[PDB]
Ligand binder design. Structure first.
Ligand SMILES: Oc1ccccc1CNc1cc(NCc2ccccc2O)ncn1
Lengths: 242, 257
């Protein structure tokens, strides 16, 4: 019968793959600013997700063709023995696009690779995309306007965004992005016990509570950050120790 | 003992105000002929179903049928400017067609951001830090009717068309359908999404955390199928709802003391 507290089965041999695409610099013709602090984000995420049992694979500054080949390769291997799939993008973005080193990629192209008809072995399993991407312009805080649409996807996808329309994303050149810092803090403390959307709700609270009334750079005053997640999940999701 | 101001992973919105709050329902069944939009048989079932379920949760429900865009904006602006100091939260439901960032009123499109914008920060100080929940059943009207001036249970199937827009802190934006999928409405029984939302509200609304409840709705709806005999062309037109959460705490609707 119907179970109001049903959970995703997370008892497979493996947790699954976590991909991280990390973009620090861009081809000069794109005239996009460097993203100092993103290496801190990459390291932070790698630790958190590997502590949760993921096989973490990171890729720095791939060209779009390279990035598409890689994510296509991952979407076509068997995930039969895995609980779930995680994909993280650390870059700049605009509308439904994220930047690779040399060109834009559509987010729907990336998520479409893992829909049921294209990736049988992930059907009914969580497919989690985490996007730190906004508009490209000693610990300095850089502030970027929200630009990437908070796009949905298929059943059992969870799309997690650093910032909503009308707000601003922040990145510290030494400590990393506000959103990734808070996400990783919460993963470290609560990742292995809390329901994951409950955890993302804590991240919403942490990030939106960061004060912007007295920034070192007076131009940044008032530029609040509010993250958000778009859930198409159909069950409760936990990452209990395997 | 007391709760020091330490980060609390279990934190809940305070829901012990004098009143639960207002729930507005904007119900649109037919449209000015120039819009060339089909009527939405079944929407009154949705409206009634929602009214019963939200009233049982303690909400003061106000329904408006087929308002023009000026009228609708006036009404929602009226509600955004009164004091919600004694309320737990605010709910706003749109039952209509839509496109992009727009919902249709009777005579014109309205941008969703203009409606949510009325409840942001000190535009509506007395809702700051309280849940502001928008529920949108709106998709692409099928236009095989004319640009001219004009009971069996059939399932109408409409392509997703309304952007799954976010909003400000403590907003929760609930969508009947995601990009690339299809919204379904039965001309007597009502919309798949609203039917399943209302069934879960009745069974679990006064215990379950509300986003956990919306996740059940995701499961229920994305598992539905149309009878192949009734409409073959509706085969492979699955419905995947979604919600975009900017909430910062757990939301429950326990019975008020
Ligand atoms: O969400 C943001 C973020 C930054 C700036 C502007 C916006 C508003 N625009 C958008 C746009 C958007 N588009 C994708 C789509 C297409 C068809 C149906 C549903 C759907 O979702 N989805 C979400 N937000």
């Amino acid at each position: 019968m119907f179970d109001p507290a049903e959970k995703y089965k997370m008892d497979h041999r493996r947790r699954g793959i976590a991909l991280i695409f990390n973009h620090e610099r861009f081809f000069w013709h794109l005239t996009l600013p460097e993203r100092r602090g993103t290496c801190a984000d990459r390291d932070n995420l790698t630790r958190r997700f590997s502590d949760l049992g993921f096989e973490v694979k990171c890729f720095n500054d791939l060209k779009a063709e390279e990035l598409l080949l890689k994510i296509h390769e991952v979407s076509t291997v068997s995930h039969a023995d895995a609980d779930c799939f995680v994909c993280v993008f650390l870059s700049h973005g605009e509308g439904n696009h994220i930047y690779a080193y040399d060109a834009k990629i559509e987010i729907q192209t990336l998520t479409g690779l893992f829909k049921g008809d294209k990736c049988h072995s992930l059907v009914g399993k969580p497919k989690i995309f985490i996007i730190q991407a906004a508009r490209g312009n000693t610990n300095i805080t850089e502030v970027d306007a929200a630009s990437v649409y908070t796009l949905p996807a298929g059943a059992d996808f969870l799309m997690c965004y650093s910032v909503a329309e009308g707000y601003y994303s922040h990145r510290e050149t030494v400590n990393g992005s506000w959103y990734i810092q808070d996400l990783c803090e919460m993963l470290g403390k609560y990742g292995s016990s809390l329901e994951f959307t409950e955890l993302l709700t804590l991240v919403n609270r942490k990030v939106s509570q960061r004060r912007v009334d007295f920034c070192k750079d007076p131009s940044a005053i008032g530029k609040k950050q509010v993250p958000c997640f778009a859930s198409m999940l159909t069950k409760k999701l936990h990452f209990f120790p395997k």
